[PDB]
Amino acid sequence: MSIIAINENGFLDKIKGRNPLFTCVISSIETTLSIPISGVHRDVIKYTPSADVELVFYGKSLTLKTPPIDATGSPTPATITRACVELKNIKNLHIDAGAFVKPKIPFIEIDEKPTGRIEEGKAMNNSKELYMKGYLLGKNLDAELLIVGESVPGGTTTALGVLLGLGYDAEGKVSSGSINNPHELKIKVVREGLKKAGINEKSSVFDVLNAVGDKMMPVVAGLAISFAERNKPVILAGGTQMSAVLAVIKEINKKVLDKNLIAIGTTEFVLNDKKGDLKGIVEQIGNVPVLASKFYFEKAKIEGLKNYCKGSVKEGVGAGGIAVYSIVNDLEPTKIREFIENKFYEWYK
Amino acid sequence: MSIIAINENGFLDKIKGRNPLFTCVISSIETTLSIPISGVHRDVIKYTPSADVELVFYGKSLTLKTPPIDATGSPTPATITRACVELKNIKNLHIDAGAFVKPKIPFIEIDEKPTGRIEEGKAMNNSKELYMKGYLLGKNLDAELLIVGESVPGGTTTALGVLLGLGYDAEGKVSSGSINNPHELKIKVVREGLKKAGINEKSSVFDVLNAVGDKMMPVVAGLAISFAERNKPVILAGGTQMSAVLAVIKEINKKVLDKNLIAIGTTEFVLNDKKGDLKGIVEQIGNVPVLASKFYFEKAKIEGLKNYCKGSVKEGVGAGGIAVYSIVNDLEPTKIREFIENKFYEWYKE
Ligand SMILES: Nc1ncnc2ncn([C@H]3O[C@H](COP(=O)(O)O)[C@@H](O)[C@H]3O)c12
Ligand SMILES: Nc1ncnc2ncn([C@H]3O[C@H](COP(=O)(O)O)[C@@H](O)[C@H]3O)c12
Ligand SMILES: O=C(O)c1cccnc1
Ligand SMILES: O=C(O)c1cccnc1
């Protein structure tokens, strides 16, 4: 039907009828101000993480007059996430780990300062502290299931860097937030940063994150470990970015990862992206469920949604994973498309 | 039962066996740095709201070297709140509505800017927006019971100003965070602010808050209404400050008080404060439960706790209300005193 499952291993039955909390962890990356690594449109990238979570939580962007778009003009995947929050009454609370511009909605502040210059190997100096903060926050969140997404423009580059720094075969395998995927530029950036920071086989996961990660990653790892340690399921709601978070979790607490309570929840558009290879990254990390939602956007009435099928946007803001939860719990998939179609005119003017 | 109850109305049964979320809403008031209205010690007042929630959430204050103290040197009531969250495994997540210096723990940011000059009638310009933010946040907090506290040094003064601005008889009835309760100074501050802002019987509740409230108040009112509207109980965990919040709630949504889902949870020290009159404020607002926890601090080894019985500190950081929840759910009250005594050296090196 409307969920594509790889290595499902009973995970879907652990989430049917369970009470979720959705949280999106946001960050900005200083590199994106000067180097065109991101597929988010340059005119909105500084405002995109906060505008995304404003749309999800409040129903419209406040930091921008219309919600964000990718380079090809397709709408933010926060449109999908908002549709699911409304259609399934999903409680949502969002976390800042360094957006350039902060949300105008209530939000959880973990670190005001953006992710740094990846090409200098100076992403952050505090990845262990951010992990600890995500874990301690997670212990105070009460839900039966955590659905944790991201909005980090540039985050497919940091995902590549972290996977490479940990020793995985990831060149050419990470996705992009738009149709074009400038792999040569991304490799140049992360290889430079890994070299400058002296990353090698002996480096710890926190050294790798400090060099070329983004600040969302340790926070999400902490939240996820806090839930799985308590025997609660977690959907890492994202694409190849969440494969990097999964690799980080394996380095921090493999025993918790081995409980089989953590899955990747993404979209059909990422799973079927021929310019990357999500399934192939995950195979290197472990036997972890990969679940992808189908949207039937080929027959959407919004051209920008039809363009997801060509590679525009694909994923983000937890869209794929929140849709997996929603569809497993009985939401008819075309209700997502119809919701967006209904709200699109007022959102985009 | 170690609980003093006024107009209980069966509320104690609504909180027994329910899973709580504890949240402390923090703010700072610009007036407190210029005029000595607060009972929090002037050396630490700027840092107190954030140090309080750091103690509760993490177990250590992180900018201050030790936790806060009142003007007499007695320990912050966050000691009680920390004891309860540990002893009863209470989940907690704290909210900033304008502390001067922010927490170093994760926290929910609602408004970074402090509450302004009460004596100028310029507390804030955005009470309506702050109410809506607390309301929408509350819809996204999943708990069976909300325990909502505050840490707002100077908050007994803004409580007096809001109560007077709404037309209550409140002079001499608000409490104080230390032994001295400077009623004549407080009344001058708030009546000057009310006059400057032009507040009268035609003003809205948001006009009153914009003149002389603190930013915690509309946030808490929104949180509380969001829960009670959903048929869930709320403990307003504070003293005379929460009576002002209750009056705000009545102005915004009086019918929600008819559900009997909102109670004030405070300490014996506030209820029995002979320099204030909590019961006499609440009687003017409505038939709302007022529940007060007993601590048996007369028998403590630490002078700082014994001083609560003489009027030091009294309440704050949700201590009274979280203790009401804990005692109703079978916590032996003296385990609080004992926990504090056991950690006092780690916290204060005394
Ligand atoms: N693609 C997107 N388009 C419009 N709005 C978006 N908000 C998030 N994303 C998504 O794309 C970004 C990652 O892709 P890259 O590495 O190319 O920047 C993240 O922000 C992700 O959430 C968006
Ligand atoms: N009294 C206190 N002493 C030490 N630390 C405190 N933290 C909060 N309070 C408490 O006292 C303050 C209100 O009293 P006033 O209007 O006199 O300032 C609030 O901060 C309240 O939480 C404290
Ligand atoms: O692979 C990802 O994580 C991804 C792809 C497209 C857009 N946002 C994220
Ligand atoms: O009356 C109050 O609200 C109060 C009294 C003392 C300390 N904190 C609050």
Residue numbers in the entry:
A (entry chain B): 1 to 349
B (entry chain A): 1 to 350
Sentences from the paper on this structure:
To gain insights into the mechanism of base activation by the PRTase from Methanocaldococcus jannaschii (MjCobT), we solved crystal structures of the enzyme in complex with substrate and products. The protein fold consists of an eight-stranded mostly parallel β-sheet with connecting α-helices on both sides where the substrate binding pocket is built from the connecting loops and resides at the end of the C-terminal end of β-strands.
The structure of the complex with α-AMP was determined to 1.4 Å resolution. This structure was determined to understand the broad specificity of MjCobT 11. The reaction product was prepared in situ by soaking the crystals in NaMN and adenine. The overall position of the adenine α-ribotide is exceedingly similar to that α-RP so that the primary question is how the enzyme can accommodate nitrogenous bases that differ in both the composition of the aromatic ring and its side chain substitutions. Superposition of the two structures demonstrates that this is accomplished in this instance by conformational changes in the polypeptide chain between Ile 69–Thr 74. This section is ordered with α-AMP and disordered with α-RP. A change in the conformation of this loop, when α-RP is bound, is necessary because the two methyl groups in DMB overlap with the ordered loop seen in the complex with α-ribotide. It is conceivable that the disordered section allows for varied substrate specificity which is a hallmark of CobT. An adenine specific interaction arises between the carbonyl oxygen of Gly 177 and the amino group of adenine, but this does not alter the conformation of the active site.
